[PDB]
Amino acid sequence: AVQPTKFAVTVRQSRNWADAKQRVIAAYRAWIRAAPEIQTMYSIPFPVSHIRTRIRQEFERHRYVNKLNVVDVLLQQSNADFQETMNFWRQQSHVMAFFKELPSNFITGFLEGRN
């Protein structure tokens, strides 16, 4: 067959919640380990602290998931997004599209038009 690429990971299902628990930590660790390496690959002018902050928030939005089959789709997406980033397939515009650098009240929203 054709060779899987450098960070290609075989798609496998989580055995139990302990499996998923350990994989999510492995994925979060691997992301924040790579933040210094992302910065010089993509010439990020922000410091690495901001990059790791964004990694933390992406993981935090899936914090309250209690379904193995939703976590494994999520562990799939991060694996592909990690592989995509580390092999430098995406470019600076894609990585900067990921950093964003709604009205806070009804009355603020009303006065400007909806938002």
Partner: protein, 242 residues
């Protein structure tokens, strides 16, 4: 112009006239009955060899479809690759169809070829946004990229697939554009920005909105029900009178 000695002007040749043209009417479905019996027996035979997985089969004109449950993807395709009467050694294609009315949204449709028997066969299974499907990349090297297209376009995981990632969409792209609920023009669009000196992403605005003329569809049903063409050998008997 130096004309060749034996090439006459071909337009200058008179064509004999043709007048009344007779043309017989043909139902193009009638040629497919001489193998209707055979396509139903083959589909029935598979139903009996592999009754753990094969739910139903249908025969339309010359196409035989096999319906299976997703947990049987490996054994069924192993049977269709290696059996003597089932030397289906190519995967022509692997695609998905979205049916949002169905709990299992996605219909995974594989198409196989058997050059030994000059035969084609269709196998269909189902998945949803969270149920994965067993990959067939261990039996068919050529299925690697098809399953990547289903995953990219519809969002179906293929457990066991090596290197399952996007193949069609842009790199940072989010969403599965062949889903029915995915809008035709998407959510974002790009432009080069003068202030930032790069390509940036923005929420999608359109100078002229897409005009869906689907509401002009006929108020009257135009096709009807069709006909039944099942052979007698696959219909139940009728109780004769008295």
């Amino acid at each position: 112009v130096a004309l060749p000695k034996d090439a006459p002007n071909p337009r200058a040749i008179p064509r004999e006239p043709v007048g009344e043209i007779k043309q017989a009417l043909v139902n193009p479905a009638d040629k497919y009955q001489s193998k209707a019996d055979n396509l139903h027996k083959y589909g029935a035979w598979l139903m009996s060899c592999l009754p753990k997985y094969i739910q139903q089969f249908s025969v339309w004109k010359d196409e035989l479809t096999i319906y299976i449950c997703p947990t049987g993807v490996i054994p069924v395709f192993s049977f269709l690759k290696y059996n003597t009467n089932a030397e289906f050694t190519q995967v022509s294609d692997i695609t998905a169809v979205d049916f949002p009315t169905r709990e299992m949204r996605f219909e995974i449709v594989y198409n196989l070829l058997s050059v030994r028997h000059n035969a084609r066969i269709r196998v269909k299974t189902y998945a949803d946004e969270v149920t994965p499907v067993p990959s067939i990349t261990s039996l068919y090297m050529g299925a690697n990229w098809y399953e990547r297209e289903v995953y990219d376009m519809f969002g179906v995981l293929f457990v066991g697939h090596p290197d399952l990632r996007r193949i069609m969409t842009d790199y940072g792209f989010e969403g599965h554009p062949l889903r029915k609920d995915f809008p035709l023009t998407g959510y974002t669009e790009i432009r080069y920005d003068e202030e930032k000196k790069r390509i940036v992403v923005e929420p999608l605005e359109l100078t002229q909105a897409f005009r869906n003329f689907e509401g002009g569809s006929s108020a009257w049903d135009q096709v009807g029900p069709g006909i039944d063409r099942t052979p007698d050998t696959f219909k139940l008997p009728t109780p004769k009178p008295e």
